[PDB]
Design an enzyme around this catalytic site. Structure first.
Site, PDB file in Angstrom:
ATOM      1  N   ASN A  22      -2.626  -4.547   5.729  1.00 35.36           N
ATOM      2  CA  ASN A  22      -2.794  -4.108   7.108  1.00 35.36           C
ATOM      3  C   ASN A  22      -1.542  -3.496   7.607  1.00 35.36           C
ATOM      4  OD1 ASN A  22      -5.460  -4.850   7.473  1.00 35.36           O
ATOM      5  ND2 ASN A  22      -4.884  -6.905   8.193  1.00 35.36           N
TER       6      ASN A  22
ATOM      7  N   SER B 266      -5.641 -12.337   9.351  1.00 32.83           N
ATOM      8  CA  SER B 266      -5.263 -10.943   9.083  1.00 32.83           C
ATOM      9  C   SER B 266      -3.829 -10.634   9.497  1.00 32.83           C
ATOM     10  CB  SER B 266      -6.199  -9.985   9.819  1.00 32.83           C
ATOM     11  OG  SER B 266      -7.087  -9.348   8.906  1.00 32.83           O
TER      12      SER B 266
ATOM     13  N   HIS C 170      -6.440 -14.441   1.756  1.00 34.03           N
ATOM     14  CA  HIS C 170      -7.015 -13.423   2.656  1.00 34.03           C
ATOM     15  C   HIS C 170      -7.968 -12.517   1.914  1.00 34.03           C
ATOM     16  CE1 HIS C 170      -6.257  -9.476   5.088  1.00 34.03           C
ATOM     17  NE2 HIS C 170      -7.366 -10.064   5.501  1.00 34.03           N
TER      18      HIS C 170
ATOM     19  N   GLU D  56      -5.135 -11.335  -0.768  1.00 39.11           N
ATOM     20  CA  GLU D  56      -3.707 -11.480  -0.530  1.00 39.11           C
ATOM     21  C   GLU D  56      -3.477 -12.953  -0.448  1.00 39.11           C
ATOM     22  OE1 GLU D  56      -3.311  -9.286   3.345  1.00 39.11           O
ATOM     23  OE2 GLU D  56      -2.170  -7.857   2.031  1.00 39.11           O
TER      24      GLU D  56
END
Ligand SMILES: CC(=O)CC(=O)SCCNC(=O)CCNC(=O)[C@H](O)C(C)(C)COP(=O)(O)OP(=O)(O)OC[C@H]1O[C@@H](n2cnc3c(N)ncnc32)[C@H](O)[C@@H]1OP(=O)(O)O
Lengths: 280, 280
Positions: free
Chosen positions: B188, B117, B138, B150
């Site tokens: 994120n 992450s 991801h 991602e």
């Protein structure tokens, strides 16, 4: 509270007008020349037209709504309105002038409200002798659709004012949230930096435009990507808000990206100019 | 690529497994204990059961998916796989150990991928003799349903390696986005700071919880309020992600609020602990 004055007949002022008139209220939109007053009401009408076409209202629903509405350039037309929503122009000197006029013109119980995104309800309150009935009542574009209104108390704002505005909101079927005056209130403080964040990601060679927007739609179930969202909101609006956040707090956390600032200088402001982060 | 090793049988691993196996691939899931794996495969089965009850797939489909999945404790079974997706803990020392080990075990063409992450693909790639074959890939919870992956390119990640992963994600129905490694990638980097902002807002008594969440859902059309979203992602995770951003960039902009840091010390991590910003 039957009678509602709205200053400003642009995207937001007009939307707000549609919002009150459509749930029973009588509304007078006021601007600086009939050209604008007219253009807005024009747009309201177009709006209701599209609603009748989609069977969301009847022609009579509409034909009625429009009768609850009238235009003007005289502030003096506000003497019998119960609510005022200023959605004019995001400049402090003028807002101070405007609220000082309505302090004079309006029946003493009339609550005076601002649709400002950035500027200080408190500082505007101070230009009147009714600080205690000066509040922010902040709608979101498009105003007849979006159910939220931030009800922003300035330092002097009364409870009673707060309650009235809360009830008034509930009565046009918006949901009100209490905010204590502070930079960007709740939505703008989160939403615009999000968009500014993206512009940094763009600028930093991290990822292209379409990938960034796709990432938030499909990765975070966002209704749209921050870049398109910005082209919607208007990059100038977006830059302005980041600048106020920066200026209000002195906190470099809210600095605009050079990128955002370059697009706005290009005049690539988004949808409304046919071009921003994307082309139209 | 027909054959994928998924290191890790947690929520994320088991989902990533389901995601490849439901669209044609042979998949091996591995964890350090036979109870761990069995759980994961149980997670996968219950999920597939749901899709049958929802007429989203047939019972036959279900059996086909399962027949393409085997569990194990033995790192060596990856030897012959075309792709590894590491979905184990979020620690650099160990990721390097794991990636170094997979370097040893696997056939030269195996692409080695990390579900991380926040952590450095470049750095993890540097503990292997295979940097060009190392990439991030991801997924998002729950992996079978969310369409974004991602695809994080590390400093040394070949075009060839990128394209194949790109290609592999489309082929299981995900929209892959190209990401040049930078702190927090895209999602994120944007989403978490928004949650952090919520916390500052709350910390500063601008509004209260239900109001902050409602504001974003009704003013911004988000499917969930940032504070709740925090509770569901896990506050400890959110705080960690914010510290990575902050330490990676040296930018005061990503400083986490005292409040969030406090809640995490209380063990108020959100749903998984019964209490975060809200109670449960
Ligand atoms: C001043 C400030 O403070 C700064 C700000 O405003 S910041 C706040 C700005 N806005 C936001 O924050 C949120 C942005 N909005 C969104 O993300 C919204 O989710 C959204 C715009 C994507 C909604 O899109 P949507 O759900 O597809 O709209 P849609 O399904 O058409 O419904 C909305 C209504 O708009 C109208 N509409 C539809 N098409 C239209 C058109 N071409 N022209 C005009 N009106 C139209 C219709 O009345 C429609 O109603 P129905 O669908 O029930 O018939």
């Amino acid at each position: 509270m039957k009678k509602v004055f709205v200053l400003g007949a642009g995207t937001m002022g007009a939307g707000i007008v549609q919002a009150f008139a459509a749930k029973g209220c009588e509304v007078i939109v006021r601007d600086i020349k009939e050209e604008f007053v007219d253009r807005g009401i024009a747009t309201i009408t177009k709006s209701l037209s599209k609603l009748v076409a989609k069977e969301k209202i009847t022609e009579a629903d509409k034909e009625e709504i429009l009768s609850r509405i009238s235009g003007t350039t005289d502030m003096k037309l506000a003497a019998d309105c119960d609510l005022v929503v200023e959605a004019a122009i995001e400049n402090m000197k003028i807002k101070k002038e405007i609220f000082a006029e309505l302090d004079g013109i309006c029946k003493p119980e009339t609550i005076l409200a601002s649709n400002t995104s950035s500027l200080s309800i408190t500082e505007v309150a101070s230009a009147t002798k009714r600080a205690d009935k000066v509040i922010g009542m902040h709608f979101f574009n498009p105003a007849p659709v979006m159910k939220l209104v931030e009800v922003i108390r300035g330092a002097a704002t009364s409870q009673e004012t707060f309650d009235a505005v809360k009830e008034m909101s509930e009565s046009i079927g918006k949901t009100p949230v209490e905010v204590a005056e502070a930079p960007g209130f709740v939505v703008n403080r989160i939403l615009i930096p999000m968009i500014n964040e993206a512009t940094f990601i763009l600028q930093e060679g991290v990822a292209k435009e379409e990938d960034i927007d796709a990432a938030m739609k499909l990765g975070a179930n966002h209704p749209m990507g921050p870049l398109a969202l910005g082209d919607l909101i208007g990059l100038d609006v977006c830059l302005a808000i980041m600048d106020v956040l920066y200026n209000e707090t002195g906190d470099t956390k809210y600095r605009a990206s050079s990128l955002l600032r370059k697009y706005v200088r290009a005049g690539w402001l988004g949808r409304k100019t046919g071009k921003g982060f994307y082309d139209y």
